[PDB]
Coordinates of C-alpha atoms in Angstrom, one line a residue:
Chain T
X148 CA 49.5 145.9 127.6
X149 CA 53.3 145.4 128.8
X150 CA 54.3 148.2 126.3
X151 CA 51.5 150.9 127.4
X152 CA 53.0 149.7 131.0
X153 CA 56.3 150.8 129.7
X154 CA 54.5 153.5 127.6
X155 CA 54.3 152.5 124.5
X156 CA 51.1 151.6 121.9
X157 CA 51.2 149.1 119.6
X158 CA 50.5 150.9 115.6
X159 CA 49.9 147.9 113.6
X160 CA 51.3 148.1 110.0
X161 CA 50.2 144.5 108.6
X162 CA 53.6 143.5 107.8
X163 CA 54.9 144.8 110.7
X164 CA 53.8 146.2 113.8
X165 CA 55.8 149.3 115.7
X166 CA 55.4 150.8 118.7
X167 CA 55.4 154.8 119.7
X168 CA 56.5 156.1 122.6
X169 CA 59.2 158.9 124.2
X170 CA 62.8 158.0 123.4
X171 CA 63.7 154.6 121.5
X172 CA 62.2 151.8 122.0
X173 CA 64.1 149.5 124.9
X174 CA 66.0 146.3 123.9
X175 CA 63.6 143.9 125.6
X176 CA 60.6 145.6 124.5
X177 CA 61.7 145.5 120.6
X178 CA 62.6 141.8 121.0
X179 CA 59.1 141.2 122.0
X180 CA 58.3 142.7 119.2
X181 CA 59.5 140.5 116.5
X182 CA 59.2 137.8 118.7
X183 CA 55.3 138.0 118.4
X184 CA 55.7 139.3 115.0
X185 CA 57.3 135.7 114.3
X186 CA 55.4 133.9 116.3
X187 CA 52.1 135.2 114.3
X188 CA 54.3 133.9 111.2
X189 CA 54.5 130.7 112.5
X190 CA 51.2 130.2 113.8
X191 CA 49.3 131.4 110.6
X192 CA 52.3 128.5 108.8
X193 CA 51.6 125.9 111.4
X194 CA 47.7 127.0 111.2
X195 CA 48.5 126.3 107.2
X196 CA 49.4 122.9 108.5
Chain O
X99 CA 68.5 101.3 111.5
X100 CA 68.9 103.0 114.7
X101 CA 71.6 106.1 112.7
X102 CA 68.6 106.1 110.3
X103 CA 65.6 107.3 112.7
X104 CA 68.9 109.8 114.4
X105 CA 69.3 111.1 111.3
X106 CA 65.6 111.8 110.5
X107 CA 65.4 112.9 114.0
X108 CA 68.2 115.4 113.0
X109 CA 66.8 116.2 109.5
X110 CA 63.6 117.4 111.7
X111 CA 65.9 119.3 114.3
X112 CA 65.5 122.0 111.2
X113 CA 62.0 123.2 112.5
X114 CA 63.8 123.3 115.8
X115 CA 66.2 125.4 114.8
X116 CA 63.9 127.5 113.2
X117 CA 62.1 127.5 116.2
X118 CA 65.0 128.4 118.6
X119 CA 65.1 132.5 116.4
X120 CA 62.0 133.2 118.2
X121 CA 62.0 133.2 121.8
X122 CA 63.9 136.1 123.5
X123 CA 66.8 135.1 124.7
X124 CA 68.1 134.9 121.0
X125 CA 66.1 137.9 119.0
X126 CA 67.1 140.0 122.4
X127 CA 70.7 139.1 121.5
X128 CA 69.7 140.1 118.0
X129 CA 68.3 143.7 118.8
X130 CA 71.3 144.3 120.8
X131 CA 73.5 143.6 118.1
X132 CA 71.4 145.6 115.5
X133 CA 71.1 148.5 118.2
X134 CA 74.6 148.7 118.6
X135 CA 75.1 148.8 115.2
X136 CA 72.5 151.4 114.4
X137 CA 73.4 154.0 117.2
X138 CA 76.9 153.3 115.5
X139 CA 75.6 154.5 111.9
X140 CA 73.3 157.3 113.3
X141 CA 76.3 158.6 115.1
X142 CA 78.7 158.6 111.9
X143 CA 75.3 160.3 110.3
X144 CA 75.5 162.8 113.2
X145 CA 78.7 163.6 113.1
X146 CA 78.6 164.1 109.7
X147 CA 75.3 166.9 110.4
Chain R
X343 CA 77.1 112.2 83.9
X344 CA 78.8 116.1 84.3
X345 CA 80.9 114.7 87.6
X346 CA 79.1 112.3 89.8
X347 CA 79.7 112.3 93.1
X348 CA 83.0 111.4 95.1
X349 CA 81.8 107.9 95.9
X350 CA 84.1 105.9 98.6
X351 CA 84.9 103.0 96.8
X352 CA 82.5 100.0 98.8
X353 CA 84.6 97.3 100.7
X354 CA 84.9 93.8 99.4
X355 CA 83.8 91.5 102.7
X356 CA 82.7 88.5 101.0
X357 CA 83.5 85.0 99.9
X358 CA 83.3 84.8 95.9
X359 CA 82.4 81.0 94.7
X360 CA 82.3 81.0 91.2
X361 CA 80.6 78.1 89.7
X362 CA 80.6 76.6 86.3
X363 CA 81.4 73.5 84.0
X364 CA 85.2 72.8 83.7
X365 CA 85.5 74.2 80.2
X366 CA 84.5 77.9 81.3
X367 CA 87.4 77.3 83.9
X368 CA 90.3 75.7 82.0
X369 CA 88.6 78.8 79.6
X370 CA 89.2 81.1 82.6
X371 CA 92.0 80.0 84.8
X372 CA 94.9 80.5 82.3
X373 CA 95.3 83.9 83.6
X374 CA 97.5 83.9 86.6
X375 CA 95.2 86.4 88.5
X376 CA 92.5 84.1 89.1
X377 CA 94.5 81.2 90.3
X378 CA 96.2 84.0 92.5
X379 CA 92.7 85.4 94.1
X380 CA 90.4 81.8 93.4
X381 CA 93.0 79.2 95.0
X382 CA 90.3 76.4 96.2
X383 CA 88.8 74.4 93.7
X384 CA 86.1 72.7 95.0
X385 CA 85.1 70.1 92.1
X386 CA 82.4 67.8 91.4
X387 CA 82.5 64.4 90.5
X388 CA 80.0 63.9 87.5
X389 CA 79.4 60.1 88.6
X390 CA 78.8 59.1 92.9
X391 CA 79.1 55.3 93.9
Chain S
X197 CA 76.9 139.3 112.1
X198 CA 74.0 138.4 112.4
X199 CA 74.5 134.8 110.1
X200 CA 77.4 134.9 112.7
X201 CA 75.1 134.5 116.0
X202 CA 72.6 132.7 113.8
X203 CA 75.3 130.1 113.3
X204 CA 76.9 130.2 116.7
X205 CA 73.5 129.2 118.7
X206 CA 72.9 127.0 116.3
X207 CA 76.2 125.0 117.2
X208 CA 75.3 125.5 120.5
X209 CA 72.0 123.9 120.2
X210 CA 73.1 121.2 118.3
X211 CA 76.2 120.6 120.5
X212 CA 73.6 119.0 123.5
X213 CA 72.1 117.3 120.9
X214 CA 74.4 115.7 118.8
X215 CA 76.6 114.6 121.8
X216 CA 74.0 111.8 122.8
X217 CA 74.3 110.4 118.9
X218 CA 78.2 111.2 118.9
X219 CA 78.1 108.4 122.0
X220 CA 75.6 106.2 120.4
X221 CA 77.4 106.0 117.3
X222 CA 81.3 106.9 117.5
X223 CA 81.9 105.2 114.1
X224 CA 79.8 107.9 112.4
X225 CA 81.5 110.6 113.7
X226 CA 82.6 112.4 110.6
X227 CA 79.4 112.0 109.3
X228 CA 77.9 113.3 112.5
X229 CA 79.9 116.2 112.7
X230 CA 79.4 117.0 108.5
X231 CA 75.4 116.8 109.4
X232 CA 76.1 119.6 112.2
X233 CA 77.8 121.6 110.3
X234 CA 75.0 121.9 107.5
X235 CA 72.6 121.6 109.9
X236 CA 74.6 125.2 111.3
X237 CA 75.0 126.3 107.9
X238 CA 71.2 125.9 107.1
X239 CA 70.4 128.3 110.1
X240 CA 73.3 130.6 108.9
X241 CA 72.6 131.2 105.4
X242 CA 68.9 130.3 105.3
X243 CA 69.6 127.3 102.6
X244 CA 66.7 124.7 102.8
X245 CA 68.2 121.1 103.5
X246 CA 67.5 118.4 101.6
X247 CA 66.6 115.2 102.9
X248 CA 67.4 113.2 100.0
X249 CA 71.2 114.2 100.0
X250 CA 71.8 113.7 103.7
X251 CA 70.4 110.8 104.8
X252 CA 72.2 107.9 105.0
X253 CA 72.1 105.1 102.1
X254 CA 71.4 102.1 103.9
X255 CA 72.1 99.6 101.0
X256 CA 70.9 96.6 102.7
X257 CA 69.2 95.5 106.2
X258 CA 71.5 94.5 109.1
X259 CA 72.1 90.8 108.7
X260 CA 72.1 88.4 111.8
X261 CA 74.6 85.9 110.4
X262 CA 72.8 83.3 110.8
X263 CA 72.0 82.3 107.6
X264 CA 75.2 84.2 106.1
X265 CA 74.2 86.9 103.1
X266 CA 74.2 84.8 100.1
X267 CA 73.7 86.2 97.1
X268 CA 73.9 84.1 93.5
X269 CA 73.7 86.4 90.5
X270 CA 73.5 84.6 87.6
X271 CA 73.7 88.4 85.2
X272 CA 77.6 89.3 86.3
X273 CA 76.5 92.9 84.5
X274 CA 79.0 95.7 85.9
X275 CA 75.6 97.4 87.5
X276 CA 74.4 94.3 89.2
X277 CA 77.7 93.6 90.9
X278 CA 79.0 96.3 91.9
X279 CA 75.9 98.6 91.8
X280 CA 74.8 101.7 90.2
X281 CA 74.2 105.1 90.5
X282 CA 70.7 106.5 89.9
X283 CA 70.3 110.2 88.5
X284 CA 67.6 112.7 87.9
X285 CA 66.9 115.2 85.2
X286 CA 66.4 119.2 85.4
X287 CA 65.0 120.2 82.3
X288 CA 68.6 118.3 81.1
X289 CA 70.5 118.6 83.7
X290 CA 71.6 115.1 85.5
X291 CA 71.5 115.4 89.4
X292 CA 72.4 112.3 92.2
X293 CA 72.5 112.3 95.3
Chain C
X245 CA 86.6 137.2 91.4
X246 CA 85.5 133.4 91.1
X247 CA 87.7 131.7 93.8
X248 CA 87.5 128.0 92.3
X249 CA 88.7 129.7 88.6
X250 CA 91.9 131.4 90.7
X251 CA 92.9 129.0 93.4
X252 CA 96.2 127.1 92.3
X253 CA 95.4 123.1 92.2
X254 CA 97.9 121.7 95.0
X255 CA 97.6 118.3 93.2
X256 CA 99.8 116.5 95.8
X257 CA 100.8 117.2 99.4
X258 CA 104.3 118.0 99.4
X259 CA 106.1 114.9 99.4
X260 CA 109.5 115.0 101.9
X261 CA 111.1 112.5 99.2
X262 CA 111.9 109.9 102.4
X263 CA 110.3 108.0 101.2
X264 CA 109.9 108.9 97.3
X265 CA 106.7 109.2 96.0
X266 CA 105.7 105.7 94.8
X267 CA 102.7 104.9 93.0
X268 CA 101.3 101.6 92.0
X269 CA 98.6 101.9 89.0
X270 CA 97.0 98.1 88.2
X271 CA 94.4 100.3 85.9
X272 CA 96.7 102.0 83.6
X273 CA 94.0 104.1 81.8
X274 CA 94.6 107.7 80.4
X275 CA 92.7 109.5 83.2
X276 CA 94.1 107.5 85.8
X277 CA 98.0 107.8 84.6
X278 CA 97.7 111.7 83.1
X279 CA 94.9 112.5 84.9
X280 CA 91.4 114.2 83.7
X281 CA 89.2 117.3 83.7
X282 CA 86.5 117.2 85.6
X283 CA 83.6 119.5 84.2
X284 CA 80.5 121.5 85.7
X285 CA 77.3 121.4 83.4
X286 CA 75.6 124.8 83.6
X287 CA 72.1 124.1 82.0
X288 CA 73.9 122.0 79.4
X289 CA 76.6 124.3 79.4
X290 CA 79.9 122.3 80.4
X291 CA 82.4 124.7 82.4
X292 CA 85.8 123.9 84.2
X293 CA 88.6 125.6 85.8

């Protein structure tokens, strides 16, 4: 939902997830990116735990 | 004793410090580094076009 | 072992009393270095009033 | 670059958090500052720490004094006075720590 | 380039000769008066440089 606010949707990959959208993707909105991208990582590790 | 239960302390600080690479101050440093140096490589690529 | 490790050498803090029967002694104190380093000979009188 | 920043937040982390030990314990100071430094190191190059090499070999409890640490050793064996050092084996290849 | 195999071994800091090197050994063993070579075992495979 914040990237369709900024205009973007979320393509999920499996490995990775990008996002489409006019123009590059902004700096803020990327780090969101593979901060959720990480923080899935973690959760399915720490889930593991 | 006490430099003993530091130490562990500090021996757990590693999940910490994993921890601190995914919130956004850090990654957002990250992207802009890896932004910069992109739009760096694309514009060599450009040039060369 | 290939190397070991660089070990500090451990401090010596302590009091060594070494105890035994004359003959281990007269045995032992004809090198110089132990009446150099053990200087108080605390004996024992084999018979008490 | 980026094992660069990696390493520089880490440091900066670890500054806030080591000062509080650096206080508590100014006598381990180099060994305080050589734990940082992997600790940095680990979150530069990704290089799993291991606890058995970094902590701290405390060879016997703190003693009050009161009685004084007596010890009567009755085997004078080069091991039993002066201690030894332990190893491990990797498929023949003898490790310590 | 192996930097361990090509780094000259500085085996004493510079000594200003006031006052002259002195040493002392009690221990006068070969490795401690001419000194060893210390070895790497590479799967059982001793190396040194």
């Amino acid at each position: 939902r914040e990237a369709q606010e900024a205009g973007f949707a979320l393509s999920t990959n499996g490995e990775r997830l990008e996002l489409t959208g006019p123009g590059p993707v902004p700096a803020e909105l990327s780090a969101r990116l593979e901060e959720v991208t990480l923080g899935s990582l973690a959760a399915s590790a720490e889930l593991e735990v | 004793i006490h430099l003993a239960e530091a130490v562990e302390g500090l021996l757990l600080e590693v999940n910490r410090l994993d921890e601190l690479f995914r919130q956004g101050s850090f990654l957002r440093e990250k992207t802009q580094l890896e932004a910069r140096f992109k739009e760096a490589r694309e514009q060599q690529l450009e040039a060369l076009r | 072992a290939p190397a070991g490790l660089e070990v500090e050498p451990f401090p010596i803090q302590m009091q060594v009393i070494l105890v035994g029967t004359p003959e281990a002694f007269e045995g032992l104190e004809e090198d110089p270095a132990f009446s150099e380093l053990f200087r108080i000979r605390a004996e024992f009188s084999p018979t008490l009033p | 670059a980026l094992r660069r920043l990696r390493r520089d937040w880490a440091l900066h982390y670890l500054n806030n958090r080591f000062e509080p030990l650096f206080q508590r314990f100014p006598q381990a100071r180099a060994y305080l500052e050589a734990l940082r430094a992997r600790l940095a190191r680990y979150a530069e190059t990704g290089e799993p720490l291991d606890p058995a090499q970094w902590r701290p070999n405390l060879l016997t409890s703190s003693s009050s004094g009161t009685p004084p640490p007596i010890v009567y050793e009755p085997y004078a064996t080069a091991p039993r006075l002066f201690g030894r050092l332990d190893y491990l084996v990797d498929r023949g290849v003898w490790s310590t720590n």
